[PDB]
Write a protein that binds this DNA or RNA. Structure first.
Lengths: 738, 246, 288, 138, 138
DNA sequence: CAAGACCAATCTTTACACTTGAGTATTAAAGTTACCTATAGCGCCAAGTGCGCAGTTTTT
DNA sequence: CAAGACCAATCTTTACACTTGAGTATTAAAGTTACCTATAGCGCCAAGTGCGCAGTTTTT
DNA sequence: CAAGACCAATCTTTACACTTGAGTATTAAAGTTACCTATAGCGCCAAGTGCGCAGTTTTT
């Protein structure tokens, strides 16, 4: 490595911040300038004070402390390996030993020196800069030679892309002339001038006479060594000159650094500010791809070996980005060699830095990694879900219009493996999230045996929550009692009614409440019923019926190019009363396009529609004994589950509820034939349902608080989830912005 | 925003029901009498314990919860502070090559109540709580203070074992924390404090922590508010120190 | 030029402390005729009122004027002075967002009573913005747009049928585009700029209007990313995505690395595909 | 610092269109106490008067304020607005000479009633001036 | 345009660290024909010579060139590189005087062998100069 | 008696050695340094012009 | 015993009073402040869901 | 019959030859140019897959 740690105490927006475990690529994300620019300012100030530049001291986070400290730990293991060896008796190695490693090995005895040599040791050098209240600066190492040498060995290069200069390439030369160590001091500039003017002269002297005349005319400063080397290099190069222009500038910068550092022991640290600014997304992805290609082409491992491959450590690259494309490409290409840093705000307003897990052991997840997955890294609050219906509901524009707080939460569907290797808890990240799952993932009910059985994920949750089996006593006893009740859930048997459709005495709502209360500390919320079960509730049945009326009255058209003769012929052939179902089947059909019909045809269609609506209401209220049976039938017909958590396919395979299944089949094949294509889970009936419902209630009432109250009454559970999420969002927003 | 407790704040949030009668009847809130305080003896030390049934315990606990926890402190105080610990008190001295450890003799017994009033005054509104008889600040100090029957000479005393004594000690000693931190930092010494135990470490190669000058200067700084250094617990060593086991 | 003014806002080189375009915009947009109100009458009027003693302020200002050699006041300067004196405040990454958002709010609010319909062109509105910040910027613009919108349903005092200004903005971020498409529905247009055979510029209109409300709701960052794609390989299952995205396989074929592989259902393919959108983003639909 | 302010005028890098130091100088020099005059009272007062219909200007400004997110007015901004609105004009080699001459005229005229005695340092007043122009400036 | 070039030197906005006009002037004034000297031949020639080991400098420069994407060298850039490498120094109120004086010295000295007769226009040469300094410049 | 705090330069800036990519006991050459100075009132000598080398206060 | 070094805020920024240009004994109003918060595990009560108020180490 | 206005490139940019400072009859080498492309529906041939070369309108 190059830098082991950076620690800032009581400076700018930092209270006490320690950054370590630096990888080869460090991606910095978060809310803008909540400490990003402050960290950059801290690093720049430390490296400016390292080279004895007169720069203004930084401000204190709170004036109730006398000083602020910046501690840099350099990893000098490789340099110790470089110099302690006998072969390299050069002047530079000798000076490096006398400066950095002496006064720390002198104190040691022979045994400890041997132990340090022989062991697989790591050597560190800690330098602390302290700013007092009266602007004075104190170093923990009082030798300026140490500071200058540390500045040389670990140079800091800052590249800003917004204010980049596409025609000023001076940093390129200042970088290349320094990186590769050519000793032109031994080559006299007097000898070099005589040498070059000996050669390039057309006549030996003619060029020299011209240059001597110029020099006698022009009053020039003596050449500095860096100027000499820059002249050398860019004269020998076959070219001095060189949105996409900034990309090329940055890409050549990184290529030069990575290529040139392979032969040197100097390991620079490069910080890039918004590399993607002014870049097409494909251009940013290609920039990261080119950087990775340069990185891996020069990489030597146990497999890749040969001339042209080195084991020299690579420079440490920080870059602060705001685009998911850069982050996605980094994560995909760099694997285990990158780190993602998240910047947020504490309670007292100070900056908080976290490391988000971006390394995945599942290669499939790395390959399928796309823009949507990389977007979650910028999320303020995540609502992980399980199916597409949840995404359809929680993303509904009309619903989120009435709840602006929930508009800041990103809803993402996560599989069990995806959730296992993405979730913030395992990533120890401070991006708050909630995992919304159904209660069926823990307990499965058997009608034949009338018994609940426990799912493995419930056992895993119990094992995670039973951490008190290895510890002492405190106020956690109620949790143990709840876990005991969860254990007793297994042995209990419960009787069913109507061949396994309803529970005699048991309320799954109470068990769901207990599970949610217990597991809220694990950030998982368990909804009592499915989303399609939550929308189809007893309170919203009128509006649901209204919706059906709408899809009959407005979304239906006539299946004939000649409405008049068609409607007359099927009025004649099929009776309005005794044959309403086939008449409606032949006459009406669902169609996006609504051709204009005649007044008589429109009146006849309206009359048939009203008659069919009355018939359907009568038959719905007649065939089903109670409203609960109606709700259950509608839920199953759309793919839902009963109070016993059984799907229509599950019942068909098992063979229970034959009468209810046949009734639903009769309704779908006779009365609800038009709504059959919308019976599927992916039909998008949720969006139309919610849009019509919210528009209708807005027509009913004109107050925003009142409309929220009505929506809460209609969908108690979905609105409860939304309100809990919004309250948590506001709490964590006060945790960040408050 | 600096916390500011006023009459409404005391009436609603702090007093709640513990002193409802005293606030509606306009009767002065009284001192913590000897009946509410029991005196335990631990070696040569004496500890003061207030009964939970008394309203003073409730108001003290709520004072810790809502008022004392909001006043800012100094970063060198690693004791009785949210997030502080002994390991955090020892950590900044790993970079030091010489170590010195000092103690304050009877830290809590030597905390003058006048200093406490001066420290808590800017954070409490200068109002009259009860008519023109008792001030709000004096009522709160009544809540936090005590008169030891063993030693009536000192009058008001902050006793060990109360609800609010540690945090009040930290707030009153923030002044010396700042002064000692400034001195040590200008000398290049890393300083930290846990209760009354102060630890200094010099990372450079020097005999500063071993000279009598350092002890004299720390004693001179402590003398401003009347504290003293326990000379039996003064320790100075090079290249390693064994502080109470660590 | 007066009836259809052109306002260009560049966000990269925006000036967070120079708000002169704001005043040059507001003083022009709402048509108040201060010419009838004499500046002589106004000066006498204002110095009559604001004077502590009638004349004292006037004596001080007269001394100043005798000292300072001033150009005659231009009408626009007069109106700017008027407005920002009457306003309760002259002063005002996120700073640029606030600048742009207040610009758009001022335009949309002020143009409702006038027949002047400006055209506003924004250059990279999302530059230096967190993705959530850009999405919130588009959301705020849409809220301002719809709150002042009067239709057959929404009517009342505070709702106008005045045509809105035409807003162009050139973006490079899928977040801005996704939020626009989601929020504006049928009222937005997506323009694609490419190059012809002979190197000349070619402009196309990409279909961003969807009749399937479910597709509008499920619209996410991945779907809006395809608008920037050089070449699309539409597929049917997750296995295709696993194969064609394999890093080791794409290492050996750098040409295919520029093609985005997206899984599309039949309905999604029906309402997204470039053929129905007559767009020049070449694509191939791989099916069994 | 208040009683003996320091004003530095550089003529080479002078800005012929940025006159902010003029306002920062005049608003400070003559001591008018506008703090006693409430900005709430002043806003109501001014919008009472300048309104074509009492409220019409106020309705327009209220719509603007609801639209524009503004910082609270600083006192110096208030005084600068006051002065240059009441003045019959905001706008104004030889241009630099006029800038400097009006600066000195404002200082000398305004300091007569105050006990504040500023110190003014000018860097190359004659830069870019015809000799007769410099003599006329003096 | 070539035979009678026009050079304009402004002293107020002169850049004491940007000396590009000096090179653009000297590379043009004295007519050396480096076109006959191949830049391929010159690159091989120079890397033959300046190499510590014949090729070592060339290997380093070839690695750089493979890394850096460079435009082809323009002739004026070639000549400027030539001259200021061969010169014993690239780097250089009174600073502006020295800039102008060296400009005039270079022009007068270099034009003696050429038939190109430039016209040079100076804007306020005395700006920021002590009177004795201006007299010494003349 | 007895001790933490024991100037600021000294020419300066850059920098690998060994056999071409990894390495377990202690600074320096070199380009520029990069330019400096004899002897100030008194004495010797040509012999009155020109050249060579008997205060106060404070520390004390 | 005995002492130099005795936090940082506390709302902040600006500023004449008297009779219109000189003047020999002690801060402040005002615009904005400009927005804050009860109650986190345990106990009471409806009676098992929902609402109100028996550790280690270190100082000691 | 009879005429002013008779594309824009064509590779591009720079530039002394003769014996070292003045001189009275006609463009160019050279570095980069600096990189290009066979064959798009129909016919031949392996013989139905794969490879090689009978419209409208307007000018007329």
């Amino acid at each position: 490595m190059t830098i082991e740690s950076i620690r800032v105490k009581n400076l700018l927006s930092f209270d006490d911040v320690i950054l370590r475990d630096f990888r080869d690529i460090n991606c910095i994300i978060g809310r803008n300038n909540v400490g990003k620019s402050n960290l950059l300012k801290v690093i720049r100030y430390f490296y400016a004070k390292l080279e004895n530049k007169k720069v203004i001291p930084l401000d204190f986070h709170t004036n109730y402390n006398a000083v602020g400290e910046i501690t840099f730990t350099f990893d000098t293991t490789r340099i110790k390996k470089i110099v302690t060896s006998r072969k390299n008796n050069g002047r530079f190695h000798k000076h490096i030993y006398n400066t950095l490693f002496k006064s720390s090995s002198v104190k040691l005895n022979f045994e400890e020196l041997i132990a340090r040599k022989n062991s697989t040791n790591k050597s560190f050098f800690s330098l602390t800069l302290t700013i007092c209240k009266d602007d004075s600066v104190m170093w923990s190492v009082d030798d300026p030679k140490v500071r200058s040498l540390l500045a040389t060995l670990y140079p800091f290069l800052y590249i800003e892309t917004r204010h980049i200069d596409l025609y000023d390439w001076n940093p390129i030369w200042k970088l290349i002339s320094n990186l590769n160590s050519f000793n032109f001091d031994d080559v006299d500039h007097d000898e070099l001038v005589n040498f070059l003017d000996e050669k390039i002269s057309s006549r030996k002297g003619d060029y020299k006479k011209y240059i001597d005349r110029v020099v006698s005319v022009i009053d020039t400063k003596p050449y500095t060594y860096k100027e000499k080397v820059i002249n050398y290099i860019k004269v020998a190069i076959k070219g001095d000159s060189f949105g996409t222009n900034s990309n090329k500038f940055l890409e050549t910068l990184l290529h030069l650094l990575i290529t040139l550092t392979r032969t040197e022991f100097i390991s620079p640290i490069v910080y890039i500010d918004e590399p993607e600014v002014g870049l097409h997304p494909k251009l940013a992805e290609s920039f990261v791809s080119n950087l990775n290609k340069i990185y891996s082409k020069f990489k030597k491992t146990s497999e890749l070996s040969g001339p042209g491959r080195y084991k020299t450590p690579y420079p440490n690259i920080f870059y602060s980005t705001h685009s998911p494309s850069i982050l996605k490409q980094t994560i995909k290409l760099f694997g285990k060699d990158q780190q993602v840093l998240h910047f947020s705000k504490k309670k007292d307003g100070s900056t908080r830095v976290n490391k988000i897990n971006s390394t995945y052991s599942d290669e499939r997840f790395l390959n399928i990694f796309s823009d949507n997955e990389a977007r979650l890294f910028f999320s303020e609050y995540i609502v992980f879900v399980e199916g597409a219906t949840e995404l359809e509901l929680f993303r509904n524009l009309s619903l989120l219009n009435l709840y602006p707080a929930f508009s800041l939460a990103d809803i993402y569907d996560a599989n069990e493996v995806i959730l296992a290797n993405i979730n913030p808890g395992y990533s120890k990240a401070s991006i708050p999230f909630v995992i919304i799952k159904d209660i069926d993932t823990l307990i499965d009910y058997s009608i034949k045996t009338e018994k609940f059985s426990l799912r493995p994920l419930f056992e895993k949750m119990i094992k995670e929550l039973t951490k008190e089996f290895d510890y002492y006593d405190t106020g956690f006893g109620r949790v143990r009692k709840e876990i005991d009740l969860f254990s007793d859930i297994q042995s209990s048997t419960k009787k069913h009614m109507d061949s396994g459709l309803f529970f005699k005495r048991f309320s799954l709502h109470n068990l769901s409440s207990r599970i949610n209360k217990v597991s809220r500390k694990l950030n998982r919320y368990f909804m009592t019923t499915t989303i399609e079960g939550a929308l189809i509730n007893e309170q919203s049945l009128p509006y649901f019926f209204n919706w059906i009326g709408d899809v009959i009255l407005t979304q239906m058209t006539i299946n004939n190019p000649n409405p008049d003769k068609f409607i007359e012929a099927m009025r004649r052939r099929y009776n309005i009363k005794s044959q309403v179902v086939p008449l409606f089947k032949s006459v009406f059909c669902i169609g996006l396009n609504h051709p204009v019909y005649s007044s008589a045809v429109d009146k006849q269609a309206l009359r048939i529609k009203l008659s069919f609506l009355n018939y359907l209401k009568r038959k719905v209220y007649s065939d089903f004994n109670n409203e609960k049976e109606i709700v259950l039938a509608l839920r199953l017909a759309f793919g839902g589950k009963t109070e016993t958590q059984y799907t229509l396919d599950k019942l068909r395979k098992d063979g229970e509820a034959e009468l209810f299944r046949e009734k639903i089949k009769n309704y779908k094949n006779n009365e609800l034939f038009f709504l059959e294509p919308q019976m599927t889970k992916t039909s998008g009936w949720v969006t139309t349902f919610l849009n019509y419902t919210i528009e209708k209630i807005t027509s009913e009432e004109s107050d925003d608080d009142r409309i929220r109250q009505k929506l809460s009454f209609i969908f108690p559970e979905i609105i409860s989830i939304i309100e809990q999420a919004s309250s948590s969002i506001e709490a964590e927003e006060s945790s960040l912005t408050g | 925003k600096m916390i500011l407790v006023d009459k409404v704040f005391y009436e609603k949030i702090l007093s709640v029901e513990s002193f409802k009668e005293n606030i509606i009847t306009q009767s002065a809130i009284p001192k913590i009498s000897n009946k509410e305080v029991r005196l335990i003896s631990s070696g040569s030390k004496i500890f003061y314990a207030i009964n939970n049934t008394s309203p003073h315990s409730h108001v003290q606990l709520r004072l810790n919860r809502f008022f004392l926890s909001h006043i800012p402190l100094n970063s060198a105080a690693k004791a009785f502070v949210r997030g502080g610990s002994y390991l955090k008190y020892l950590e900044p001295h790993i970079y030091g090559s010489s170590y010195c450890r000092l103690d304050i003799s009877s830290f809590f017994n030597n905390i003058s109540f006048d200093d406490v009033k001066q420290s808590l005054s800017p954070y409490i509104k200068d109002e009259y709580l009860i008519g023109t008889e008792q001030k709000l600040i004096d009522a709160i100090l009544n809540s936090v203070g005590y008169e030891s029957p063993i030693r009536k000479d000192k009058g008001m005393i902050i006793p060990m074992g109360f609800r609010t004594s540690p945090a009040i000690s930290n707030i009153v000693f923030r002044k010396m924390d700042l002064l000692i931190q400034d001195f040590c930092a200008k000398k290049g010494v890393i300083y930290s404090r846990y209760a009354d135990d102060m630890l200094f470490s010099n990372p450079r190669e020097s005999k500063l922590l071993m000279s009598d000058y350092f002890i004299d200067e720390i004693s001179s700084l402590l003398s401003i508010m009347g504290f003293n250094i326990n000379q039996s617990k003064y320790i100075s060593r090079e290249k390693e120190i064994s502080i109470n086991g660590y």
